[PDB]
Every structure is written in C-alpha cells, then in structure tokens.
Amino acid sequence: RLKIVTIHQEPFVYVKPTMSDGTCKEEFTVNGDPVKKVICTGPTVPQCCYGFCIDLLIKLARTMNFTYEVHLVADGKFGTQERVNKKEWNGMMGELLSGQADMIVAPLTINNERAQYIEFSKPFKYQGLTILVKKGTRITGINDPRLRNPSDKFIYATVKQSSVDIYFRRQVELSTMYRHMEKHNYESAAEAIQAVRDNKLHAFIWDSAVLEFEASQKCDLVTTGELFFRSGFGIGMRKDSPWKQNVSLSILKSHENGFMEDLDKTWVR
Amino acid sequence: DNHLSIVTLEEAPFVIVEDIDPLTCVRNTVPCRKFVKINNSTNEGMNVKKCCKGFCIDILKKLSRTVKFTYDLYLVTNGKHGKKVNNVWNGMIGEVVYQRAVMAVGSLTINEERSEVVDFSVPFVETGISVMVSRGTQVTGLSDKKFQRPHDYSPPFRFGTVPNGSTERNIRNNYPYMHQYMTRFNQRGVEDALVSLKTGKLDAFIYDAAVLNYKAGRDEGCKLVTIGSGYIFATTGYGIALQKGSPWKRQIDLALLQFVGDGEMEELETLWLTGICH
Numbered sequence: 001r002l003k004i005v006t007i008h009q010e011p012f013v014y015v016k017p018t019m020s021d022g023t024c025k026e027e028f029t030v031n032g033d034p035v036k037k038v039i040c041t042g043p044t045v046p047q048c049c050y051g052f053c054i055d056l057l058i059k060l061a062r063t064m065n066f067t068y069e070v071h072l073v074a075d076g077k078f079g080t081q082e083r084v085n086k087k088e089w090n091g092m093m094g095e096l097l098s099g100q101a102d103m104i105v106a107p108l109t110i111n112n113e114r115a116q117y118i119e120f121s122k123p124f125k126y127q128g129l130t131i132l133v134k135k136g137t138r139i140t141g142i143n144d145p146r147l148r149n150p151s152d153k154f155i156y157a158t159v160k161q162s163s164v165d166i167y168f169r170r171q172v173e174l175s176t177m178y179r180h181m182e183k184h185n186y187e188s189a190a191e192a193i194q195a196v197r198d199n200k201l202h203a204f205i206w207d208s209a210v211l212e213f214e215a216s217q218k219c220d221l222v223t224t225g226e227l228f229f230r231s232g233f234g235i236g237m238r239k240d241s242p243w244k245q246n247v248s249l250s251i252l253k254s255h256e257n258g259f260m261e262d263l264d265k266t267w268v269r
Numbered sequence: 270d271n272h273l274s275i276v277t278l279e280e281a282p283f284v285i286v287e288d289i290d291p292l293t294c295v296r297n298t299v300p301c302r303k304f305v306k307i308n309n310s311t312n313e314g315m316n317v318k319k320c321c322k323g324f325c326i327d328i329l330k331k332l333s334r335t336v337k338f339t340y341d342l343y344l345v346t347n348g349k350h351g352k353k354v355n356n357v358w359n360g361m362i363g364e365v366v367y368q369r370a371v372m373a374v375g376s377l378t379i380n381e382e383r384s385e386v387v388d389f390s391v392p393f394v395e396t397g398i399s400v401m402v403s404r405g406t407q408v409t410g411l412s413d414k415k416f417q418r419p420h421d422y423s424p425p426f427r428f429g430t431v432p433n434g435s436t437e438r439n440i441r442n443n444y445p446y447m448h449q450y451m452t453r454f455n456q457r458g459v460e461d462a463l464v465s466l467k468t469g470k471l472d473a474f475i476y477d478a479a480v481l482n483y484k485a486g487r488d489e490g491c492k493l494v495t496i497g498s499g500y501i502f503a504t505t506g507y508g509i510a511l512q513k514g515s516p517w518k519r520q521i522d523l524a525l526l527q528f529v530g531d532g533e534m535e536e537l538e539t540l541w542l543t544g545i546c547h
C-alpha cells in the first residue's frame with residue numbers, strides 16, 4: 001500500500017471537508033464528467049481530495065495496479081534543505097526521504113537540488129514562474145524597478161520553503177531581491193494570493209500553472225503574462241525505486257494519448 | 270574508459286553541419302564525422318570529416334566540461350531521429366539500442382516507445398505537437414474542433430503535416446478522422462509547409478513545437494505565428510538518449526538541471542533559438 005503525500009494547491013489538489021458520514025460529495029463537471037474524490041488525511045481529520053494531481057494519481061494507480069492512502073504534508077510545505085552539522089529536508093521532500101511517504105503526487109518542481117536526493121519522473125506539466133498582482137497595479141515584469149531595487153513601499157514575496165525560494169537563494173544576482181523577499185514570504189500560496197486581494201501583498205512570484213488559473217477565476221487579479229523562468233512538475237519517488245520507470249513511462253503515455261490535455265481542460269483551462 | 274561514442278543528426282538550429290575549413294574545425298564547431306556512401310548499390314563508403322555547431326552542440330560542450338568526458342561525435346547515416354521499422358530501430362535511437370553510440374545528442378524527442386528501449390535525460394528544451402498559421406487565423410491547438418471535424422466548417426480548414434514522423438503517427442492514433450482528412454495536405458518538409466502558408470494554399474501546419482517556434486521567430490515580416498504554449502499537445506521535450514541503465518544518466522541529469530537553474534540554458538536559447546519576432 002503506497003503512502004502518497006500531497007499538498008493543498010489549486011487547481012492541482014483541492015481539499016474540502018468530509019460529509020457527516022465520512023464520505024465525499026459526488027460531483028460532475030459542467031461537461032458531464034465525474035469528479036473523482038479520494039480520502040486524504042491532513043492537519044488529523046480525513047478530508048476530500050480532488051484535482052489535477054488526484055486524477056493523475058488515480059490513472060497511475062490503475063495503470064500500475066496499486067492501492068494507496070493519501071495524506072497532506074505535515075508542515076504544509078513543498079520542501080527545502082535546511083541546516084540542523086547535519087542537514088535535513090522539510091516539507092514533502094522531508095517526508096519522502098524519511099519514509100512517511102512512498103511517492104509525492106503534487107505540483108512538485110523538478111530542480112537540481114531535489115534531484116540529488118530523490119528520483120523525479122518525466123514532467124507531467126510543463127510550466128514556469130510568473131508574477132501575480134491585483135488589478136490596478138501594473139508592473140513591467142521581473143525587471144520593474146519596484147522589484148529590482150526594492151523598498152518598503154512595494155512588497156513582494158513567494159511561498160516559504162518552496163522551489164521558488166531555492167531559485168532566489170542560489171543566484172548571486174538575485175541577492176537584493178531575495179533580501180526583500182525572505183522578510184515577507186508566506187506559509188502557503190493561498191495565504192499569499194489572499195494577501196494580494198487584501199492589498200497587504202503587492203506582488204507574488206509563484207508557479208504560473210497556479211497564478212494564471214488564479215487569474216482566470218479571480219478577476220480581481222492578473223499576472224504579468226511573462227514567464228521569466230521555466231520549470232516542470234514531476235512525480236517524486238525515493239532513490240530506489242521500483243516505481244520510477246513505470247510511473248515515468250506512464251506520464252509519457254498520458255501526454256501522448258491526450259489524457260494530460262483532458263486533465264488540463266478539466267482543471268487548468 | 271570515459272571516452273564516449275556520440276551520435277547526432279543535422280537539424281538547424283539544434284545541430285548545424287558545415288564542411289571543413291579547406292584550410293581543422295573552425296570556431297564554434299566540433300569535429301563530427303559522417304559515413305558517406307559511394308553509391309546506393311553498396312554498403313561501401315568513406316568517413317567524411319565535417320564540423321557541427323548549434324544549440325545541442327553547445328549542450329554537448331557544456332556536458333563534456335561538467336560531466337568530464339571526451340567524445341567522438343558522428344552523424345547518423347541511416348534514418349533520422351529514430352523509428353521502429355519491423356521491430357528494428359533506425360536513426361539516432363538505433364545507434365544507441367544497438368550500442369554503436371553511448372548517447373545521442375540532438376533534437377531528439379522524448380516519447381514512451383523510445384523510453385522503453387533507451388534511457389532519456391531530463392528534457393532540456395520543451396517541445397510537443399503545435400500549430401502554425403498566418404497572423405489572423407484563430408485556432409486553439411491540435412484538438413480544436415476545426416481539426417477534429419474539418420467539414421463542420423465551410424469552407425473546411427486546409428491543414429497538414431510532414432508524414433512518416435512522430436506527428437503523423439500521433440495524430441493517426443489519437444484522431445483517426447483528422448489524420449484521414451489531413452492526408453490530402455501532406456507537406457514535403459518544413460520549408461515547403463511555410464511557403465504553403467505564406468502563399469495561402471495552406472491554412473495551418475501541425476508539427477514539432479520547438480521547430481515551429483524557431484521558424485515563427487525568424488519569419489520575415491513576422492507573418493507566421495504559433496499557438497500559445499498552453500495549447501501545445503502531448504507536451505514533452507528534447508532529451509539526451511543513453512543506453513538502458515547507463516551510468517552517465519545521473520550526472521547528465523544534474524548537469525542539465527544545473528544549466529536550467531543557473532541561466533546557462535536561457536543563454537543558449539537566445540544565442541540559437543530567439544528570433545526577431547516577439
């Protein structure tokens with residue numbers, strides 16, 4: 001029984017409360033497709049999980065013939081390596097390496113730092129980084145003076161302990177930017193996104209697969225339109241790992257037979 | 270030891286082939302040999318020396334410096350990227366599966382069939398099945414209704430691809446009637462399809478996304494455009510093919526991921542792939 005870990009990140013993973021009798025509400029899409037829901041335990045109630053990644057997990061489950069239990073990441077983070085001396089990963093990366101999870105099914109960004117300790121599938125989503133703001137405030141992009149040389153007058157940050165945080169730490173050139181960001185980062189994208197609507201946050205550097213969808217739904221928000229950096233999401237497995245080849249082979253098959261497009265049509269478009 | 274046989278395949282701007290200086294390989298190029306046939310009635314031939322440059326070649330140079338290896342580059346003589354013919358591979362993939370090359374460097378698309386017989390590195394450029402039109406034509410992507418049921422529109426859209434590749438094979442398995450209708454508009458090659466769009470005989474050309482983005486970016490007057498990258502079908506990428514269980518895959522992956530993370534990848538893409546248009 002595979003222990004799947006994941007994280008609240010719409011439109012890839014929705015997390016909604018359980019009905020009184022321990023079950024999930026049955027729902028169909030507007031195009032008449034059943035919205036598959038799985039029980040996911042998380043911070044420790046059972047809850048209802050569905051979305052882009054859940055559909056993908058179900059296909060991977062049935063294609064490779066395995067059962068699973070899904071739980072939400074304990075600390076709520078994607079995962080960066082931090083010092084203790086010794087080092088340890090937090091977030092979903094920590095739970096995968098520690099055995100709390102056998103496989104990560106989430107919008108987990110593939111990068112060099114994580115790829116040295118875990119195995120990544122071929123990407124199930126091709127993607128990038130962009131900036132989300134409120135309608136009214138307009139920014140050139142990644143090179144607007146309001147972010148290059150920052151200030152307290154214009155605030156901008158990303159999600160704490162995420163791939164974006166890793167991206168802005170490793171670069172000697174983004175030092176001035178990351179200085180402003182580390183004192184303003186958020187524990188989750190939803191909190192940051194909500195902060196932009198509340199005007200307490202002025203810009204949000206985050207995953208375009210999330211930000212653009214958040215703009216197509218919440219019309220009180222828009223993004224830059226640019227993609228200043230491109231990255232992909234992958235399935236995370238331990239270094240062993242008997243599932244690495246077939247999970248990856250199944251991601252490639254799902255792209256080629258239109259499955260990934262139908263997922264994109266259901267959740268991201 | 271760590272001296273590697275590497276196969277490649279000409280496809281500008283990813284691999285560009287030049288003759289030798291008359292008069293050693295020149296500047297931006299690396300030596301790449303090509304076994305040239307004497308005629309078509311014999312297997313007899315001669316190793317011709319040539320010079321290879323381009324996007325993927327720069328990748329090869331960066332990998333050689335980082336992963337620390339030496340190599341003999343050569344161009345594939347039989348086939349293109351790789352196609353299983355009667356369960357027998359040819360092209361760049363063939364050189365790997367049958368162990369004449371330890372890795373393949375080029376515009377080699379990662380798919381499921383090839384990943385069964387070879388190992389692929391992480392993708393170093395995004396590609397897929399995309400659509401190119403003239404400015405002013407409104408189409409979503411491959412799965413647009415004006416492509417799946419062309420005769421639902423009057424007049425029907427005129428669109429095709431270059432046959433016998435991964436594009437035609439993908440469309441035939443996924444949309445049988447689309448493939449049936451679009452046979453009539455099969456193009457001889459990429460350049461012929463461009464001219465067909467420019468002169469109005471074609472309404473759309475379905476092909477490799479990375480190739481179409483490069484052509485649309487270089488097009489004179491910028492009249493040809495591709496759909497948004499969000500509507501690319503069967504998204505995937507060009508990757509390095511290695512032998513199954515190759516010991517080089519891990520270090521190639523981390524080096525490739527390093528180039529993406531430290532900007533060395535974006536630099537190569539403006540030195541080779543970015544054009545006048547947008």
Ligand SMILES: N[C@H](Cc1cc(C(=O)O)nn1-c1ccc(F)cc1)C(=O)O
Nearest residue numbers: 350376377378397398434435436437477
């Ligand atoms: N680099 C070629 C693939 C390329 C050749 C052609 C063609 O001749 O039809 N179309 N594609 C292509 C098809 C599907 C994708 F997702 C991306 C590219 C290769 O490696 O074979």
